[PDB]
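Q: Okay, next protein. This is Fucoidan lyase from Flavobacteriaceae bacterium SA-0082. I've checked the sequence twice, so it should be correct. Can you predict the 3D structure?
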Amino acid sequence: QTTTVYSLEDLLPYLKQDNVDVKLAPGTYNVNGFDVGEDRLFSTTPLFLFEGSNSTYDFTDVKLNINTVVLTKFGNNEVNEIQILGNNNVLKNLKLEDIGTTAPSNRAQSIVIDGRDNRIEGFHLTIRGSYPYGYGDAFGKGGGSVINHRKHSGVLIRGLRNHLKDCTIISRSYGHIVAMQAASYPTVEGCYIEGEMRSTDDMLAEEGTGSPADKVDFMTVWGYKLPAGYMMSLQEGGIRAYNAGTTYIDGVEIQRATDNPTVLNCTIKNARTGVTLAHANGTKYVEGCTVLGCENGYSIGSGTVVNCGADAIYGPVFKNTYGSDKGYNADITILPPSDAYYNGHDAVAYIGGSNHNLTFRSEITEIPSNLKIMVSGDLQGLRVLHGSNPSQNNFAGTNIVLRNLTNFPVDLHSDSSNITVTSCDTDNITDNGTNNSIEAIDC
């Protein structure tokens, strides 16, 4: 039997109860600064704390507008709009929009999924309000920042067997769009994930304005002045696994890495990365995805990427994260450009590590001269110049199968060895490595 409520005030009591079936009636509901306080509706954060288990919540035709000023009403603390702590809950069809662009007093998360066996389905989320907004991570995304930040991220999947399905997540905020943290068997399925871009040249045009970047003479956290010629996302990862983190299940606090992530039939647009799971453990499986205009396509470290696609307008479609990457099996289509090329990385793929099986397919005939498949070598990546992030660049590749069903040139560096290469044409293959095999295939 479904209980229908017609106010946020009447909804909140159900979030503390088990085994309920609740529907918030179709309509527009607004949360403003005046709704936060001791005798106001929201006296604590997280605003919507789903503590019960085995419950279902129907938000069909519900527009929930949350004024970004609310992110400053809880002191110097984290503000989570929605957090699920219970188990076996289903939340469906909510349209949640941050109103305005006010930055959090500290930081914010739109949705946090702890517990186990929860599902959020059919949500439409628009994320706003963060600082600094306009630079990506150039001036710091963690500690020791050049410009101190007030990040605001989208969906954080933790817990066990938690599931995000058929959601639209649009970010205009400096933070991750979808991320996994201490999550065991998280699944992201059928989602559309979208940020927006800004060139480093446009940022550099702030010279002499007195902007925050102008004040630090554009000195990045990578140890050098912000280079021209790159296209950056104003968001962080599209789908990204955290290195560490904490989750809560049945009152147990758990610190662990993410393990066994699955990503299916997702479209990720204009984020710092399409799908990055290198920090996760266990079985990694990514299938049927489409990455458009991201700074990086797929970087899962190890596992399977299959029937996936990405364009190469702003960065490579594929990157091995470390030289210890092992067993990365990928079948990636290099898609037609979704916009004008602006790729300062000078690469469509950077390959290293050992025992990979990599296939690239494309119908592109006009190859920009700076674009190439690199096995080993010195990647001109925005964040790995001049010794920055040194473990993520200049590493060897050994015992790799590379099936190049593209017109893209291939550059095998001297650090490359035992690379088995097949390609449509071999004339545009430069081999400076050891015991590499290069063979021509017809089309």
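A: Here is a summary of the prediction. Residues 374 and 411 are 5 Å apart (CA to CA). Residues 326-443 form one domain.
Q: Noted. On to the next one.
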